[PDB]
Design an enzyme around this catalytic site. Structure first.
Site, short mmCIF file in Angstrom:
data_model
loop_
_atom_site.label_atom_id
_atom_site.label_comp_id
_atom_site.label_asym_id
_atom_site.label_seq_id
_atom_site.Cartn_x
_atom_site.Cartn_y
_atom_site.Cartn_z
N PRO A 39 17.93 -3.28 21.18
CA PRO A 39 16.49 -3.53 21.26
C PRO A 39 15.88 -3.56 19.87
O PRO A 39 16.44 -3.04 18.91
CB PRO A 39 15.98 -2.34 22.07
CG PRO A 39 16.87 -1.23 21.60
CD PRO A 39 18.25 -1.86 21.44
N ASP A 40 14.71 -4.19 19.79
CA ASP A 40 13.92 -4.24 18.56
C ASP A 40 13.23 -2.89 18.40
O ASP A 40 12.26 -2.59 19.10
CB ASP A 40 12.92 -5.40 18.63
CG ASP A 40 12.01 -5.51 17.41
OD1 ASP A 40 12.10 -4.71 16.46
OD2 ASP A 40 11.18 -6.46 17.40
N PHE A 41 13.73 -2.07 17.47
CA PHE A 41 13.19 -0.72 17.35
C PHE A 41 11.79 -0.69 16.73
O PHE A 41 11.16 0.37 16.76
CB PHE A 41 14.13 0.17 16.53
CG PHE A 41 15.54 0.20 17.06
CD1 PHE A 41 15.83 0.82 18.26
CD2 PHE A 41 16.57 -0.37 16.33
CE1 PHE A 41 17.12 0.84 18.76
CE2 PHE A 41 17.87 -0.33 16.81
CZ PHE A 41 18.15 0.26 18.02
N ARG A 42 11.29 -1.79 16.18
CA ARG A 42 9.92 -1.79 15.69
C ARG A 42 8.93 -2.34 16.70
O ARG A 42 7.72 -2.26 16.48
CB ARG A 42 9.80 -2.57 14.37
CG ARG A 42 10.60 -1.97 13.21
CD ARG A 42 10.20 -0.52 12.87
NE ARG A 42 8.93 -0.45 12.15
CZ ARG A 42 8.80 -0.51 10.83
NH1 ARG A 42 9.85 -0.65 10.04
NH2 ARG A 42 7.59 -0.46 10.29
N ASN A 110 18.10 -4.88 10.12
CA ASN A 110 18.71 -4.20 11.25
C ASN A 110 19.59 -3.06 10.78
O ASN A 110 20.21 -3.11 9.71
CB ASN A 110 19.56 -5.16 12.08
CG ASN A 110 18.76 -6.31 12.62
OD1 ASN A 110 17.53 -6.24 12.72
ND2 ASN A 110 19.46 -7.38 12.97
N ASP A 112 21.98 -1.84 13.03
CA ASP A 112 22.95 -1.77 14.13
C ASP A 112 24.39 -2.04 13.74
O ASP A 112 25.26 -1.96 14.62
CB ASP A 112 22.51 -2.75 15.23
CG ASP A 112 22.39 -4.17 14.73
OD1 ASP A 112 23.24 -4.61 13.92
OD2 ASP A 112 21.40 -4.83 15.16
N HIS A 129 16.95 -1.61 5.47
CA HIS A 129 16.51 -0.37 6.10
C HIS A 129 17.68 0.57 6.34
O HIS A 129 17.57 1.46 7.19
CB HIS A 129 15.78 -0.67 7.40
CG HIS A 129 14.49 -1.40 7.19
ND1 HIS A 129 13.94 -2.22 8.15
CD2 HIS A 129 13.63 -1.40 6.15
CE1 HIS A 129 12.80 -2.71 7.70
NE2 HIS A 129 12.58 -2.22 6.49
#
Ligand SMILES: *C(=O)CCSCCCCCCCCCCCC
Ligand SMILES: [Zn+2]
Lengths: 289, 6
Positions: A39-42, A110, A112, A129
């Site tokens: 999922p898009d954590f932001r 990302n 991930d 990040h």
């Protein structure tokens, strides 16, 4: 006047196969990993906790809170841990860029690890990040490194990860809020954008700074291709990418799923069979672990 | 430079 003979995916592919296009920078975001199940954590739409008694919601992701009360973050990490780490067609397209001698750098937002699993090496990556790939003891005099398998078993057994050498907290190498952004982000940006012939911007809405400002570091002539579900990166009329004006000369938007856009570009380049063969092989290998 | 929401 302009390097692209037309402002289409077809013009980009012709340019990519011309002598003028030697060095490609990829800028990628959460949109390239959503089809992998990450999922898009932001995104507020994703479910990112009353039981933790936080002074404020965002504290779960601020470094100074985490260092004092790490349990809320690791409980969340267990809930969100992916069931599988299978990179997408888009990740393997960048591996093909690398294989063909065209990839100057991939800058990713990302955490991930899918860029690494797909075969991009440290030298190819700017993880803007950070990453879950590695974790470090937080003590400055120790900094013992731990691999993801080690950190995974701590997260699932619900044991707060402590350093075997000094018993300090061990933190995944993601950049928490309040932490410094990586020095490599700024060092590479100062060098890479002197050399780039094409920007490939994939799966990012270009809303998070300083990553979003990378598009403004390209030379004025450098074509920029956006592959994304939604147009992004244009200047904000309340205060950039120019796809649609009469002045547009180098920016191209391909709107759709990132996997499908990379597939379309590969097919124009004559790479579709190579890409299919790589993805099917790597997916088969991951499924067989 | 520190990481923040924006
Ligand atoms: C800054 O924008 C990046 C840090 S935002 C932190 C969000 C992390 C929550 C979930 C992480 C753990 C599950 C995913 C593991 C992937 C290897
Ligand atoms: Zn230690």
């Amino acid at each position: 006047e302009r390097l692209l003979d037309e402002l289409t995916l077809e013009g980009v592919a012709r340019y990519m196969q011309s002598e003028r296009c030697r060095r490609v920078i990829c800028l990628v975001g959460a949109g390239i990993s959503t089809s992998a199940g990450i999922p898009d954590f932001r995104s507020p739409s994703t479910g990112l906790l009353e039981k933790y008694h936080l002074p404020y919601p965002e504290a779960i992701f601020e470094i100074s809170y985490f260092k004092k009360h790490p349990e809320p973050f690791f409980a969340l990490a267990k809930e969100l841990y992916p069931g599988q780490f299978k990179p997408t067609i888009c990740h393997y397209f960048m591996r093909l860029l690398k294989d063909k001698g065209l990839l100057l750098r991939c800058y990713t937002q990302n955490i991930d690890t899918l860029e690494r699993i797909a075969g991009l090496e440290q030298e190819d990556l700017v993880e803007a990040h950070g990453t879950f790939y590695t974790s470090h003891c937080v003590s400055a005099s120790c900094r013992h490194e731990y691999p993801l398998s080690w950190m995974k078993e701590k997260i699932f057994s619900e044991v707060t990860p402590k350093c075997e050498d000094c018993q300090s907290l061990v933190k995944p190498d993601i950049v928490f809020f309040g932490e410094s952004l990586p020095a490599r982000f700024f060092s590479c940006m100062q060098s890479d954008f002197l050399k780039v012939d094409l920007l490939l911007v994939m799966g990012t809405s270009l809303q998070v700074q300083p990553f979003a400002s990378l598009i403004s570091k390209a030379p004025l002539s450098t074509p920029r291709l956006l592959i994304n579900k939604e147009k992004a990166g244009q200047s904000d009329p309340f205060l950039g990418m120019d796809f649609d004006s009469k002045k547009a000369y180098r920016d191209v938007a391909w709107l759709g799923e990132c996997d499908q856009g990379c597939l379309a570009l590969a097919e124009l380049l004559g790479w579709k069979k190579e890409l299919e063969d790589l993805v099917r092989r790597e997916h088969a290998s991951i499924d067989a672990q | 430079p520190k990481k923040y929401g924006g």
